[PDB]
Amino acid sequence: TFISRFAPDQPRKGADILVEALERQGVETVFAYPGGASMEIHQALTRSSSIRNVLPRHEQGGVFAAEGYARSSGKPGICIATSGPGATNLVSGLADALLDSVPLVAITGQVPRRMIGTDAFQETPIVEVTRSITKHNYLVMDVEDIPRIIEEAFFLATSGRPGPVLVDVPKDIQQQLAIPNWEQAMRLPGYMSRMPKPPEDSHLEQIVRLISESKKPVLYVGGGCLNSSDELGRFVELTGIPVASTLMGLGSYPCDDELSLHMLGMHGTVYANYAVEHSDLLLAFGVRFDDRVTGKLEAFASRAKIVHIDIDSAEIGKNKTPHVSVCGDVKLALQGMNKVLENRAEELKLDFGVWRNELNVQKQKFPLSFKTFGEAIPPQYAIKVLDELTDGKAIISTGVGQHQMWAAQFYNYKKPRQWLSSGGLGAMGFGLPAAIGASVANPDAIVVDIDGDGSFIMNVQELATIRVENLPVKVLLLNNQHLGMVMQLEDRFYKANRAHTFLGDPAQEDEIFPNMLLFAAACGIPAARVTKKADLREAIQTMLDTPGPYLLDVICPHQEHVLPMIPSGGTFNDVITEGDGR
Amino acid sequence: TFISRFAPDQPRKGADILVEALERQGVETVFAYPGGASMEIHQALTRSSSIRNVLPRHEQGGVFAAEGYARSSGKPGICIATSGPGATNLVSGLADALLDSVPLVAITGQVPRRMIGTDAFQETPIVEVTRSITKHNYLVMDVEDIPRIIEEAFFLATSGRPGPVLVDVPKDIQQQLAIPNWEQAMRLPGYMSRMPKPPEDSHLEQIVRLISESKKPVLYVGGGCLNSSDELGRFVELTGIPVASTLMGLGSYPCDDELSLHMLGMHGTVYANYAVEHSDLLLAFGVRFDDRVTGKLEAFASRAKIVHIDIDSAEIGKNKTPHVSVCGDVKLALQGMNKVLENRAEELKLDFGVWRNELNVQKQKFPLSFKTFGEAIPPQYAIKVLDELTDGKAIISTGVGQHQMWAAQFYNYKKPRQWLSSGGLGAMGFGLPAAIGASVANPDAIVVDIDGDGSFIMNVQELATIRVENLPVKVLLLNNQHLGMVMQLEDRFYKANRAHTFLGDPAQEDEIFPNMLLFAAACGIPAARVTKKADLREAIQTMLDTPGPYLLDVICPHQEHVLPMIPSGGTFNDVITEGDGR
Ligand SMILES: Cc1cc2nc3c(=O)[nH]c(=O)nc-3n(C[C@H](O)[C@H](O)[C@H](O)COP(=O)(O)OP(=O)(O)OC[C@H]3O[C@@H](n4cnc5c(N)ncnc54)[C@H](O)[C@@H]3O)c2cc1C
Ligand SMILES: Cc1cc2nc3c(=O)[nH]c(=O)nc-3n(C[C@H](O)[C@H](O)[C@H](O)COP(=O)(O)OP(=O)(O)OC[C@H]3O[C@@H](n4cnc5c(N)ncnc54)[C@H](O)[C@@H]3O)c2cc1C
Ligand SMILES: CCOC(=O)c1ccccc1S(=O)(=O)NC(=O)Nc1nc(Cl)cc(OC)n1
Ligand SMILES: CCOC(=O)c1ccccc1S(=O)(=O)NC(=O)Nc1nc(Cl)cc(OC)n1
Ligand SMILES: Cc1ncc(Cn2c(C)c(CCOP(=O)(O)OP(=O)(O)O)sc2=O)c(N)n1
Ligand SMILES: Cc1ncc(Cn2c(C)c(CCOP(=O)(O)OP(=O)(O)O)sc2=O)c(N)n1
Ligand SMILES: [Mg+2]
Ligand SMILES: [Mg+2]
Ligand SMILES: [Mg+2]
């Protein structure tokens, strides 16, 4: 029973209705940056005793913070901006939240309704702009539609395949007085009628049946299983099938397990790709068959009966036609298939040890390797130190690049929603703000941003947010003085011809530039720079033990390459297993 | 006669065609940030000996740099980004370039054509997103369309009412081989048929006739006159009409002149608004009748015969119906009206000294004032020092806020394209990157960014660009520790209730935060912080005399208010002439 700060018959500003609409949705943290077209909302936010605002230093940081808030908690992330330039600074976060299916609700202020379409001051058609990069969006044309639109926005952003929903609110609506009707029925008939139903035992038993007829099965787990953590583990006990995870599904099934194949795909392990390439049953649970995972579709799992479970009926048969398909929640499919596998325990000769010991051969012949030159810090080793020193129980956000792949390969995430990384859109500068949101959603957790010198500087202004809000965000900066991932593609396919990939100062090429420590200093954040591999363990330990924020500039040799690598559009018979720019 | 780096019969990559297409357009500076979907363009850029790339640290900085490059030179500004997140980071710059009519050409890489529409890696429909915030955009579907599309893009971006044109180039097109045909005819029939013709003497003489019948005329000069600098001055000699300029048209007619009324509008001078409010002839040359200038349209110049000249037929009669109108280049209209005013010199009793001395009364009764408390640096005075110490011949870019208005009121720009500021979209963080572009377009000019502690930090990462590229960008930071413009609206209309407008550290509220000097230090830029008004003159002098970049942190009392102020939707009878949050 909600307790409003206003009488049920007392007229209140539309902005006070909007904030109360968030309170009734369980919202307790928003990332709002004020502006003229949204001051009424910001005023109403201060009147709320249950909603906290984390003021960012850039709206792109605000939306990415709402993402990290959402990815690390399963709750929807809420960011607020003003009209015009404030709204356009959310675009990257919206497109990023859509491609990775992150529950997000963005509220932008808008010019008064009479001004819309007149090219007014700070007036951009943010609805017309974001329609293709949002799950849905709204334009509030009357103050009485606020309670319904907010309820539809949160429902749409969190139900089914989650995504971002934008709600444009004109300024006059925020100022208008009304008595909100909190029991309007959501005008979503066509959406709920197509919401997936619990899976039929007809399909579920044919899958269990296909598991027993199979001899080389592989699990293809992705971002759809982030809530099916326990159900996936219990399903693996009853079958013993190896688990190849995607960059989004990392943590669903523990990486430190002997049945885990870690990540598959372009920069996935040689053995996980092998298991898929020579399998007869592919259990694709909560994946979207990305080109970063399949490459050439005709060659992807070209000997396997593909069983695809997905809550989005559009993704089923989108890029690869499966044998069996189940439109629905993969959580329920596992629950149903687990009951079928217990009551048929002794009836099913379930033992794939012949298949697993074939993989464990490839597992120990082509494992994740890294060279260690002299005392230069290998970035892969630095992350493996962070894994050990944090017991693998630390929330990890990343930017985009080599340091993003090494953060995925060389860290053993034990639970989902511990790994926050931009996968679909792959947006640099995601790490630092996502660490801000995750730290606010999980105040008593170790939150570490494994950023790169390129991605880190893009939203470096959010260091002020970390200090002001007093958040224990640890920044493990893998400084290679380059845009390494673009540099690696230059070494491989363009004869190492550098085309604007060096981020330091060419006048003093042997000086680390910029001095990231002074960035932390400007925002009153303790910092340190480690250079020799011997000092690396003590440095990371200091970063963890030092309370509050901390930036650790970890210098790395820039010629390192992320391995293995399947060239885009290739097959498993092209996986590059060694090589770097030396 | 262009000299290609390739034989006329030699097949070359589509990317090499794209770069050559820029070379043939006179391009010599681009702002490209590399990514996987645009590496082919970046490789072709290095092969070019005539095109320089200024690598930004954020694509939003890259597009804003292309803006400042364009606004300070009249040339088109060219920025390049990769697919997905690189393109979405250009959105604010595109919408900003559209609202201010800035000639700009943005080139974004895109996924291969066979991949478009499959939700591929780093694939966003950047064409579908930017269609409403660009003058036009393209999607290159064949390598042979490159020479034509680039020519149409530059023509559309620079002709008529200038604007931004986006060209999305898929990756396979960049790699495909072809012999470009550099003499394709542009498929723009409907555009050129409606391109305005030189103005008829029928309209021009009726305007000159209406000038002689008028007794209280006012010039309403805006961003449309940035190229009519000399023609406007010669027109003022022949009539003696006062010149009220807009935030965009600042510099067209010198602010230090006795006939100049400086800026009109919301934060425009009390006398310039008075001249418009009690005029019988309003010569609106190159303006779009913004709400930030008119407020209540019925009350705006409600006693004047409105003569509107504009190269965009849509803006004529859009918000205020004029008596006489001329669709065409205001430059030619001035040239024609100047000839009519010379051959009719003695025939026309042109003397408005009765009208001017009525304004010079209001001019000296309600001038631009500022209080000076103790030794605290008044921001208005700091800018007036920069005016004196640079002789008013320095290129000035700004962020958005109070420091933006004071940079407009208290600086006397003597030529147009000396004042770079986001007016239509009013996008914070515009100052620092625009100073980067203007410094590259005008290497031997004094370029000074008058940024605010909020706007400056949003794109603070571009300090690395300034150092690496060795640009003499001076940063005159007006640090008030607040989002002052939003703070002022809180003091006035919300009883000084702070709603997330303080940018410093609340734990140490009397400490300047962040330490902007350390931001400059991280990027190897000399810095200094002035606090007392006595030291202010020597500090600014040091900033100017010190070669290379320089950041001057100018601390100011935060309770200052920009005055005068006409409330949004009000009239001249509501102009607030004094008051601040004390
Ligand atoms: C530089 C870089 C390199 C990359 N390389 C790789 C790589 O080598 N390997 C890799 O795996 N990724 C890689 N990616 C990440 C990538 O582009 C995609 O995010 C990833 O490949 C696909 O993720 P996914 O299909 O497993 O899950 P998602 O992309 O998150 O999609 C979720 C899917 O599950 C479904 N779903 C969601 N919820 C449920 C539910 N409750 N029940 C049932 N179904 C549900 C949705 O409908 C959707 O179809 C890379 C990214 C970058 C930036
Ligand atoms: C915080 C803030 C406060 C502001 N307050 C004010 C204020 O008090 N006063 C103010 O003036 N502005 C203010 N603005 C700026 C503002 O919103 C608009 O940019 C400005 O009001 C309108 O500019 P303009 O009409 O003079 O020219 P523009 O907006 O640049 O439009 C150009 C017009 O001229 C025409 N044109 C272009 N080229 C030619 C040509 N060659 N020949 C003929 N016509 C041509 C175009 O078709 C167009 O109609 C403020 C901005 C901000 C961020
Ligand atoms: C910028 C917000 O846009 C608007 O809301 C707006 C636009 C056009 C006309 C009237 C209004 S209004 O009267 O409804 N409110 C404002 O104009 N607020 C406002 N906010 C800021 Cl930050 C600045 C400003 O003018 C300087 N004005
Ligand atoms: C990211 C660019 O997107 C593409 O160009 C792309 C997309 C899907 C399939 C194939 C390609 S491709 O073969 O034409 N080229 C690439 O995929 N290049 C690429 N660039 C980066 Cl920076 C990373 C990457 O995979 C890690 N791949
Ligand atoms: C905003 C933006 N621009 C461009 C890209 C393209 N891109 C770029 C420029 C990469 C290199 C990132 O450099 P980094 O320093 O942040 O990380 P590493 O050098 O360790 O790989 S990876 C990648 O997909 C991007 N992902 N995001
Ligand atoms: C990216 C963005 N967000 C929000 C706004 C809204 N806004 C904001 C937040 C202003 C205050 C800017 O603070 P500042 O420190 O940069 O400048 P002053 O405090 O000197 O006015 S002015 C204004 O129109 C904006 N213009 N741009
Ligand atoms: Mg930024
Ligand atoms: Mg790097
Ligand atoms: Mg400020």
Residue numbers in the entry:
A (entry chain A), B (entry chain A): 86 to 667
How do the authors describe this structure?
Acetohydroxyacid synthase (AHAS), also known as acetolactate synthase, is the first enzyme of the branched chain amino acid (BCAA) biosynthesis pathway, and is the target for more than 50 of these commercial herbicides. Since the introduction of these herbicides, 197 site-of-action resistance isolates have been identified.
Next, the crystal structure of the W574L mutant in complex with CE was determined. Importantly, the position adopted by the chlorine atom in the W574L mutant has the potential to impede accumulative inhibition imposed by CE.
